[PDB]
Design a protein around this ligand. Structure first.
Ligand SMILES: Cc1cc2c(cc1C)N(C[C@H](O)[C@H](O)[C@H](O)COP(=O)(O)OP(=O)(O)OC[C@H]1O[C@@H](n3cnc4c(N)ncnc43)[C@H](O)[C@@H]1O)c1[nH]c(=O)[nH]c(=O)c1N2
Ligand SMILES: Cc1cc2c(cc1C)N(C[C@H](O)[C@H](O)[C@H](O)COP(=O)(O)OP(=O)(O)OC[C@H]1O[C@@H](n3cnc4c(N)ncnc43)[C@H](O)[C@@H]1O)c1[nH]c(=O)[nH]c(=O)c1N2
Ligand SMILES: CC(=O)N[C@H]1[C@@H](OP(=O)(O)OP(=O)(O)OC[C@H]2O[C@@H](n3ccc(=O)[nH]c3=O)[C@H](O)[C@@H]2O)O[C@H](CO)[C@@H](O)[C@@H]1O
Ligand SMILES: CC(=O)N[C@H]1[C@@H](OP(=O)(O)OP(=O)(O)OC[C@H]2O[C@@H](n3ccc(=O)[nH]c3=O)[C@H](O)[C@@H]2O)O[C@H](CO)[C@@H](O)[C@@H]1O
Ligand code: NA
Ligand code: NA
Lengths: 386, 386
């Protein structure tokens, strides 16, 4: 045959399945991508004026504690030593973030020792006992007290979800969001970096294999009947939207979406940090990304007096809008379960496997998506191709 | 012969010369060390109560941009991903440090953009033009203005050197000590970490070679005549004090020294950070080290409710006191030049080479000492052993 496996979508999930089928099983793999770009939502391109790499489906920071995933991805790209750090803008002051001795000092007026800060939090937060909390405002106040909650969580949360926290589920905060030290590494994982030649280069390296064919600008649903006819017993890994597959015959799954306002400013440095969170209602956006700071090892390939920034706005998805974060109304988790049994059946009668962010209505970190793909490869696909 | 080379001192300089002679030239090397420990001032041992590694001749942070040095030392030890960060304690508040947008925000009341902060510094510092500065207070004020200088440099400098900055040389500040971003990595070098199994283990690995013999608790000056008699044409690399070699016959070289007050506290976390600078006169010490934070990858080999800390005090050296930092009175740089010509002669008539921190009256970072030793090996010693 001309191909042995069809993969719909060229994000990390698709690409991982493809590469494994190509290099481990030696099978011919055809990848079908709707967009014009390879790589799915992880994709990055250079802003044309300045040459600075930007991620146009949200900022992507790579971090994992999963050694298997880590060793795997280093086959296709090297990573930088970048460590993510975030600052939080509130009443005209940039606060160290997340909440630790750093933020505590700045906010409450003076230095607190680690022990002094445990006690400070104990008092602030005793207003509400945690097991007796009904909504999100309460749950949070119950863990860190009102002053911190109202300055750093309330407006920020309300912007991300377009809703008063009192109207939000208590189960959304699960651990204490405070560190009793000055460690402001944003992520606690073992391995962390950015792809040295950018994301596009990395994703593209995954598809660079003699056994892999890629057709950009191709909707699966326009070509599926043609292609499966060329080899009826070739299996399909579908990573597109789960509901759209079954023609929304159980109702539309509900997504939160993001609008990205991208400007080129005539300064070399707009905020001297990669990401600045804005925690006050006065500002429409949740945060501002300044992409040159994601790659400071490039400062002599970057414009001296220009910089690209990008403000992030949050809201709900009308159709046409990109799906980003699953909403998970319980009404949503409902039409999900019914779709999972549609998929399972479809898998058993049509050899069509469902994976990835869109295909399973699940949020996945990159390393999680890659691990999920490696799982499906070993556990379902190796048998399917014998 | 029983040995081909004699090395006095087992610090990084000595050890580097020894290891190179042993492994590259195949020569037998005898190392003579006055102390009971191997490793010189880089040495670390476990505090006995808690098991936490402490460095008992000052905190040692390893950092270099010298790839050759870096590749070399990784032969004897692996390094952690530790990145050094420092905070500065002033009027009961822990300030982000060194001076950047972080400290500027906290000190002046609100956030300044990178451009806004260049302008802020331009105004504060225009009180004095830099070329017209006479002492250290002026030079500093000339670069960052009085408010910053008086809050973060004056008392701190005065403690380190026991002297009013107005009585200190203007040439001691050479670049602008401010960053116009939020990057608070303390060091700007390419490679940085701490030896994974501690310093003792690393230094000891350098001397672990079939061709190297080590005699601890041995003063060179008590055994030199005996040893050189066993093989008169074996060369000597001396890394002891330069003046003491020539019986202070040109006067005593002047050193600054350090006293180290080490306590074991009954808490698991005293300040939630490795190093806290104290910038106010109210406090005798320049800073407090809390050693568990140097190695957080060990948190499950560390006491849960005990921690070792160590306050650092500065002053001048009486004899008996350890030499740490060269003072360099011009009266000092004077008796130096005369000692260099004593050494050169002694090198030519006695095959006795002078290197390292003490032997050259020079301050050396670890990587600088190692590079200086590798230099002397290739350029002077390879010939000397043929
Ligand atoms: C805003 C935001 C920010 C981040 C992140 C997500 C989001 C939403 N990510 C997560 C990351 O985006 C995620 O892990 C990957 O997108 C998952 O890759 P998938 O293959 O599962 O889907 P993905 O969406 O990437 O790929 C699906 C592909 O299928 C294509 N397709 C869809 N329908 C099709 C059809 N009918 N026919 C053909 N092609 C079709 C799409 O065009 C797309 O190329 C992240 N993770 C992390 O670890 N760190 C981070 O910092 C971030 N940042
Ligand atoms: C307070 C402080 C703090 C730091 C540092 C220095 C100081 C003073 N260092 C620098 C580091 O200490 C330095 O690079 C090494 O000590 C240099 O090693 P040497 O071999 O040159 O001398 P070093 O002093 O280490 O070795 C000399 C050896 O010779 C022995 N000796 C002397 N006289 C003798 C005699 N008569 N007979 C026999 N043996 C004799 C001594 O006992 C000693 O073991 C540092 N660097 C860095 O890169 N990062 C850091 O963070 C620090 N921190
Ligand atoms: C809850 C959720 O889906 N979190 C995701 C989010 O985290 P990410 O690190 O991007 O952080 P967010 O800005 O989305 O914060 C998540 C939540 O934390 C709270 N918050 C956060 C920051 C702040 O300044 N103030 C504040 O209150 C809010 O309730 C907010 O809804 O994106 C990551 C990368 O795409 C994902 O790995 C996470 O799973
Ligand atoms: C001038 C000098 O010998 N510096 C050494 C010092 O730097 P190190 O990083 O240890 O910094 P220090 O605390 O010794 O500061 C050096 C000087 O900077 C100024 N200062 C520093 C910190 C602060 O909070 N406020 C302030 O004003 C003072 O004038 C001080 O004398 O030890 C390092 C490691 O042992 C050496 O690599 C450096 O060469
Ligand atoms: Na509580
Ligand atoms: Na000036």
């Amino acid at each position: 045959s001309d191909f042995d496996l069809i993969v719909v979508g060229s994000g990390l999930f698709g690409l991982t399945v493809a590469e494994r089928a190509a290099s481990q099983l030696g099978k011919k793999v055809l990848i079908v991508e709707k967009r014009s770009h390879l790589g799915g939502n992880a994709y990055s391109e250079a802003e044309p004026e300045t040459g600075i790499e930007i991620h146009k489906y949200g900022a992507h920071l790579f971090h994992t504690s999963n050694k298997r995933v880590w060793d795997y991805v280093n086959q296709f790209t090297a990573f930088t030593g970048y460590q993510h750090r975030v600052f939080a803008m509130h009443n005209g002051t940039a606060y160290q973030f997340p909440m630790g001795l750093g933020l505590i000092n700045q906010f409450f007026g003076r230095y607190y020792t680690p022990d002094e800060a445990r006690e400070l939090i104990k008092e602030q937060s005793a207003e509400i006992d945690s097991k007796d909390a009904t909504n999100l405002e309460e749950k949070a106040i119950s863990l860190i007290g009102r002053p911190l909650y109202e300055a750093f969580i309330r407006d920020y949360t309300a912007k991300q979800w377009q809703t008063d926290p009192k109207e939000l589920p208590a189960g959304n905060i699960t651990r204490l969001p405070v560190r009793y030290n000055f460690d402001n590494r944003y992520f606690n994982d073992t391995y962390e970096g950015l792809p040295v030649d950018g994301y596009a280069q990395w994703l593209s390296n995954m598809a660079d294999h003699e056994n892999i064919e890629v057709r950009l600008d191709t909707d699966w649903f326009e070509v599926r009947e043609d292609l499966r006819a060329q080899n009826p017993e070739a299996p399909v890994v579908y990573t597109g939207p789960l509901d759209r597959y079954f023609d929304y015959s159980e109702g539309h799954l509900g997504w939160r979406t993001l609008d990205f306002e991208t400007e080129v400013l005539n300064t070399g440095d707009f905020q001297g940090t990669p990401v600045m969170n804005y925690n006050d209602a006065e500002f429409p956006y949740t945060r501002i990304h300044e992409f040159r700071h994601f790659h400071p090892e490039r400062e002599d390939r970057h414009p001296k007096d220009k910089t690209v920034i990008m403000k992030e706005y949050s809201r709900f998805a009308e159709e046409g809008d990109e799906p980003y974060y699953p909403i998970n109304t319980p009404s949503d988790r409902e039409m999900l379960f019914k779709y999972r049994e549609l998929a399972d059946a479809e898998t058993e009668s049509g050899k069509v496997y469902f994976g990835g962010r869109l295909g399973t209505y699940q949020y996945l970190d990159m390393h999680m998506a890659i691990a999920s793909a490696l799982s499906m490869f070993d556990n379902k696909l190796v048998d399917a191709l014998k």
